[PDB]
Design a protein around this nucleic acid. Structure first.
Lengths: 64, 63
DNA sequence: CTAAACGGGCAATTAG
DNA sequence: CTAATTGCCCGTTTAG
């Protein structure tokens, strides 16, 4: 459908999402929702970030 | 809010053909799924669901 | 690059 | 039993 605005994450958001990702490649419902609340992102944003992050990760596992 | 869909009652024939499909191919390509639905006078979704349910059951058998 | 969108699968659940 | 519903993942594609 009409397609929704691309989020531009803040440096603090990107920092803490990279950290979480470093801590954990997958999140529970609970950790996800808490990381969302702590950064003022929606659950979905955080889920799509983590999922997009894995695609890149798998790429770096295929990068050697 | 969204009413639950009626539980499809497949005919003996539809089931036999679904089961024969599954015997050959656990997975259908899109095109194959469309053909088979059309073959059986079913919706693509009816067929996708069946196949999905079927692979579950079959995992319980292989198990 | 990467956020969001897309359809299909998986597991777990719901319910006819 | 099993058809349908849920939330998430994957892999791909779309596009800011």
């Amino acid at each position: 459908a009409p397609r929704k605005a691309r989020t531009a994450f803040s440096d603090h958001q990107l920092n803490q999402l990279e950290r979480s990702f470093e801590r954990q490649k997958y999140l529970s419902v609970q950790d996800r929702m808490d990381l969302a609340a702590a950064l003022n992102l929606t659950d979905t944003q955080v889920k799509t970030w983590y999922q997009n992050r894995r695609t890149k990760w798998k790429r770096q596992t295929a990068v050697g």
